[PDB]
Amino acid sequence: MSELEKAMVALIDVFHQYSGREGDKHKLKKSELKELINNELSHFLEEIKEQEVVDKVMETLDNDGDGECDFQEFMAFVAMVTTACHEFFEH
Amino acid sequence: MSELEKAMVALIDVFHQYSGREGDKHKLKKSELKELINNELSHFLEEIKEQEVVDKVMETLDNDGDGECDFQEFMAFVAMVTTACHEFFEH
Ligand SMILES: [Ca+2]
Numbered sequence: 576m577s578e579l580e581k582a583m584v585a586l587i588d589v590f591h592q593y594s595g596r597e598g599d600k601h602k603l604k605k606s607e608l609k610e611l612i613n614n615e616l617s618h619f620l621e622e623i624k625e626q627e628v629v630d631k632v633m634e635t636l637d638n639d640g641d642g643e644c645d646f647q648e649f650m651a652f653v654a655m656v657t658t659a660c661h662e663f664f665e666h
Numbered sequence: 667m668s669e670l671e672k673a674m675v676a677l678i679d680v681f682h683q684y685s686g687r688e689g690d691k692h693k694l695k696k697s698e699l700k701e702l703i704n705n706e707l708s709h710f711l712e713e714i715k716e717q718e719v720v721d722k723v724m725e726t727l728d729n730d731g732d733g734e735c736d737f738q739e740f741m742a743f744v745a746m747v748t749t750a751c752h753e754f755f756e757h
């Protein structure tokens with residue numbers, strides 16, 4: 576596999592690692608999303624410690640209003656973070 | 667860096683490797699996009715050999731009509747392919 580292919584596999588893997596913990600196995604509830612950010616995005620995002628921030632993150636990502644983050648919504652989140660990373664080598 | 671963070675970095679890196687070849691260094695023209703798919707997605711996508719397919723792929727991905735694929739458009743493409751992969755381990 577190429578580096579790009581390996582990256583795509585890692586996205587699927589980490590999503591499912593967290594989504595499969597509780598409830599709907601194909602979606603992230605707030606606690607699953609919080610843990611994914613805190614454990615897996617610690618170099619790119621400040622740790623989430625406040626319920627208000629958990630709530631705002633889910634509200635931002637949950638485009639279909641079901642209170643959870645599905646795979647498409649997670650990929651949109653990945654796109655936003657990856658876009659923000661540009662500041663640290665271009666702008 | 668986590669597996670997720672490494673994946674994000676690989677997305678940025680591959681996009682720029684290809685986007686920086688010609689013209690606008692921040693966007694993929696048709697030839698750059700074709701080579702990215704053929705070299706870097708050979709296990710997930712059939713090789714592109716026909717101009718009609720090149721054109722359709724760009725037409726599908728180019729949401730702002732400038733005839734190129736920017737980083738956001740590229741991330742949308744990655745999301746489509748990563749979603750399609752689910753068929754090979756879920757249903
Ligand atoms: Ca879940």
Ligand SMILES: [Ca+2]
Nearest residue numbers: 637639641643
């Ligand atoms: Ca949702």
Ligand SMILES: [Ca+2]
Nearest residue numbers: 685688690693
């Ligand atoms: Ca270019």
Ligand SMILES: [Ca+2]
Nearest residue numbers: 728730732734
């Ligand atoms: Ca475009």
